[PDB]
Symmetry: C2
Subunit: 626 residues, 2 copies
């Protein structure tokens, strides 16, 4: 293609995106018109493109590419985005730290989808002068690495916004038994409000980020549940904790002002500290003294309402109404579900996005942040939720999903419906589709064999057959997934592994109860070696995926988890062999009645459940406690 009206900056960006766009022998004219977010119009080899915000050039060009690729000659496209800013936030604090090559790839894809902003969530995973323990052995980013990521986003006229922590969610830092670290603590994962050494630390954080061009930052402050109740209480006695939050907020904003920064924060603590049962989804009455303090501070910070779960527009609406009693400046954070094990939930992400979009439009939201959390070890691929990201982009620009396939093809090179099958290890038959967090991908994998804590939540025949069928389907998809084949290979192997693991685990329970030693012997001699090899092979494929996407640091926890499971499979074989041979008269583990693991979904009546903490899936014994 040839172009009129490009800058040298835009030429350079187009060279990098040519591999996605492949525009052919056409002529494209960029015009100045800023009437709508995007316009594309033409026929017979001549097309005119215009954009409102500079970054919007790259979605406009993706739309042209997609129309032409679909076989259209006449093109007439006009879009008006509902949101001034649309961001993706990757988690870099849950053990997986995105490597530079992968950040750059993500940035390119986001540019084509239409996102204005790339964000990284960093609790302790950046360097601070004279803080050697902050990020120690975690793969913390150097200033030079943050600048390289920022600058690459800036080449596409995209913003960069660090998401850090200035109160809680600092467990990886506060664990160090060094007096200069321990003096910074209140309780659990929370820093000590009012301690000058804590404000020294926080100013260090801003000194690091001041080396960037960006002056927009998310300062955190979510989920500080016991704030004011630890060393704070021992030093100062019991205080008004809503006021305490405001005091700390104002200290942090004054530091931010010194370095020229404008701030956003997670909103949940205001609601939790002022509601009678301590919950977020609550209409709260605010004490006048707190009212007055907040009213002053809401001029100087943007509150972010985060919600990844509700299935209806009105449920979001109630929360926006609650928030608007405090401030007009409310941003929204939705969820691209990739924090429930090894397998994402793009389907569920789609369901809630449709409803959250409706609410955000009804409540005049200017900014939406799509979050990509990695809870409890970062086990899901960094690229697992591309479909959910295209979904939010389509909702933001068109208010519908009618073109999601057409456009996705340009962003990834593969079919949207194929890619959605990445979810299969969570899509059990008959599950009601409005229930969140149902993650058998993870808990079927990590549960023990001798003492299977999740067994009452498994339908042995029904679920096994689903996993086996899903393995088949993913094997064929990976053949046509191109640069993404590796992530589909990972899911194909996981599904095959889960099928065999159910077959063996459930077979043992049945055979032991019936006294069928012949069956137990068949399992021990043939099926156990097969399961063990399939686990080792899965560990190898997963390490492949991890090292493609992430820094090496953090892989160590997954090695511990997989190594433990392997040693437990060997134990199960050994115990059964001793029972079959008569060396022991019973297997006490197999004589225990298995109970429901939890009752979270008892009253929705279903068999599967949510279980998302490895150390609680893997054993009923103590493991981290004294």
């Amino acid at each position: 293609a040839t172009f009129l009206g490009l800058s040298s900056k835009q030429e350079k960006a187009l060279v990098r995106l040519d591999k996605y766009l492949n525009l052919g022998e056409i002529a494209v004219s960029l015009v100045t018109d800023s009437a709508t977010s995007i316009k594309v119009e033409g026929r017979q080899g001549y097309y005119q493109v215009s954009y409102k915000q500079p970054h919007q050039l790259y979605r406009a060009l993706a739309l042209l590419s997609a129309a032409l690729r679909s076989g259209q000659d006449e093109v007439q496209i006009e879009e008006e985005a509902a949101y001034e800013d649309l961001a993706y936030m990757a988690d870099c604090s849950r053990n997986a730290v995105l490597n530079l090559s992968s950040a750059k790839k993500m940035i390119e894809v986001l540019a084509l989808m239409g996102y204005s902003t790339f964000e990284l969530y960093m609790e302790d995973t950046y360097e601070i002068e004279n803080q050697p323990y902050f990020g120690y052995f975690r793969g913390r980013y150097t200033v030079a690495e943050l600048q390289e990521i920022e600058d690459y986003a800036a080449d596409f006229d995209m913003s960069f916004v660090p998401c850090i922590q200035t109160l809680a969610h600092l467990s990886a830092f506060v664990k160090w038994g060094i007096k200069e670290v321990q003096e910074l603590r209140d309780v659990e994962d929370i820093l000590l409000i009012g301690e000058e050494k804590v404000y020294d630390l926080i100013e260090g954080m801003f000194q690091t980020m001041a080396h960037l061009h960006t002056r927009k930052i998310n300062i955190g402050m979510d989920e500080a549940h016991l704030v004011g109740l630890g060393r704070y209480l021992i030093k100062h006695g019991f205080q008004n904790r809503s006021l305490l939050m405001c005091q700390h907020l104002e200290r942090v904003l004054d530091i931010a002002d010194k370095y020229g920064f404008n701030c956003q924060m997670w909103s949940d603590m205001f609601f939790k500290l002022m509601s009678a049962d301590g919950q977020y989804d609550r209409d709260v009455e605010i004490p006048e003294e707190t009212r007055v303090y907040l009213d002053r501070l809401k001029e100087r910070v943007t509150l972010v309402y985060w919600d990844y779960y509700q299935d209806s527009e009105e449920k979001y609406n109630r929360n926006f109404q609650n928030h608007h009693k405090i401030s007009q400046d409310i941003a929204f954070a939705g969820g691209a579900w990739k924090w429930i094990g090894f397998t994402p939930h793009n389907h569920f992400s789609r369901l809630v996005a449709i409803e959250a979009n409706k609410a955000c439009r009804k409540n005049q939201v200017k900014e939406v942040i799509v979050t990509g959390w990695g809870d409890n070890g970062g086990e899901t691929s960094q690229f697992s939720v591309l479909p959910a990201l295209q979904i939010w982009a389509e909702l933001a620009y068109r208010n519908d999903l009618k073109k999601v396939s057409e456009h996705f093809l340009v962003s990834t090179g593969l079919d949207f419906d194929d890619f959605m099958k990445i979810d299969l290890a969570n899509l059990l038959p008959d599950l009601p589709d409005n229930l969140s967090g149902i993650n058998p991908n993870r808990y079927v994998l990590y549960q023990d064999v001798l003492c299977p804590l999740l067994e009452q939540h498994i339908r042995p025949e029904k679920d096994k057959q689903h996993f086996a069928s899903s393995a088949q389907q993913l094997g064929e998809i990976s053949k046509r997934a191109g640069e993404y084949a590796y992530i589909f290979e990972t899911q194909a192997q996981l599904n095959a592994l889960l099928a065999l693991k159910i077959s063996i685990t459930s077979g043992i329970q049945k055979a032991y109860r019936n006294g069928d030693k012949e069956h137990l012997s068949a399992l021990a001699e043939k099926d156990f070696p097969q399961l063990y090899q399939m686990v080792e092979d899965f560990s190898d494929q997963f390490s492949r995926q991890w090292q493609q996407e992430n820094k090496i640091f953090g892989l160590d926890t997954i090695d511990i988890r997989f190594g433990g499971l392997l040693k437990r499979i060997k134990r199960a074989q050994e115990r059964l062999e001793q029972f079959i041979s008569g060396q022991i008269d019973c297997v006490e583990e197999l004589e225990q009645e298995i109970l429901p693991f939890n009752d979270f979904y008892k009253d929705q009546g279903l068999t599967a459940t949510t279980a998302n903490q490895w150390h609680l899936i893997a054993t009923a014994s103590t493991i981290y406690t004294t």
Copy 2:
């Protein structure tokens, strides 16, 4: 031997103890706490308390084995009750066979009382999640253990928890469990369903004969600050403790129990103190005067104060009888000076129960000698009766903690555990390891323990575990420190040699150690809880493999650097920085093994 003046119960006990006592062709007649007097194959023995018959016979046995014919021994014991408490809540639940063996040994040393510490490890009617998959004791099992103690006229005292230290119960995501919670590991004071649970605890224990019990109540640091705070506002937490204690004491009275409690969380108190014995617990102080100051403070509020000392077996795989001796000598002085009636020697198992249940027999003999004689002059002679082997040999079980040049008065220094579990590529404890000095010590210790194991009879298995552990630590230091050095000087040839020769050897030694440990565990404990140690060992194995793979990719030119090895290694902690020490204390597996997140969300 021939016995006169014994009850049928006592005759059955002598029959069971002949294998320890070996009294041979003599007559013993039952006529101060203990007296033995006779000569020429006839001896008279007497006791104050029935259980003291068994120590008296041990004293006679030792006198005879030393070559005496005429024997004249008198002892006056300083303490009315002397107890040993084994931990059954840290993953290792003592099995019935081992409980019986331990009771026999305790009887011969002079202990009046056997105790088991059970947070969630017993059954309660209609509480299916309480001890679920933990190896909880049935009522029948507890009755059998108590009964075996009663055969030697020893008491049984369960040590339970009625406030905190219930982490393994409260983790269950079930409405009927979660509604019992305040915060962290603490039950909700003031909740009727919590008092329903506590009454269930007493209904179980009332199936026993004993009516003495330790109700716990230690280390509830955030009590009143969780769900309690939301429901009630901010209250006087001293007063909350009193309120909870009164409810528990009322339940105990209904079933006829007398209570003890740990004293650490401490008009109201003054009426409650009449109804409960306070236990001052201290495992650490190196001078009599430090204990005395604490007794004095305790005497401000009550004169009914028991003392709990420590037999150090909660710092990994290897105990510290040497340190236990140093502190027992001083504690004994203070307990006598302060007129204490009851001493409990505690045998905790912090963070997984990795140390043998029989690891601290020397510490237990030491406390018995101090209680009966006020000195250690006969420790070896009496220990030989109790165990069949030499006291100085058994004390070498400590070796994986006795690094050269360590000051003897500093507690918890546990390189047995943290040299084992630290990573190879990312060795978090490396700055606390002296690579030649410590390595030589571990190698020498493995050889010493190999020889001792050959003459340890029925305890050989526990010395074999320690011999393998010490040998493993020597090699692991050689490789781990060798990798740091060779990566630094760019010596790929040396990295090749380690990868091809030393790494396979290290992996085999860990597998073999896991096998030996498992034999030990199954001899002593129920099967439940071994799973956590399989998880820890398996994780180490997988990290040894990763280290070999990463080095091989560097040696073969596949990767240009190994980022792990480029990180400056910092001190792990500063606990003993003021003492100028290189070694330290590190007693949490999950913090030793990785700098990554592993239990947090």
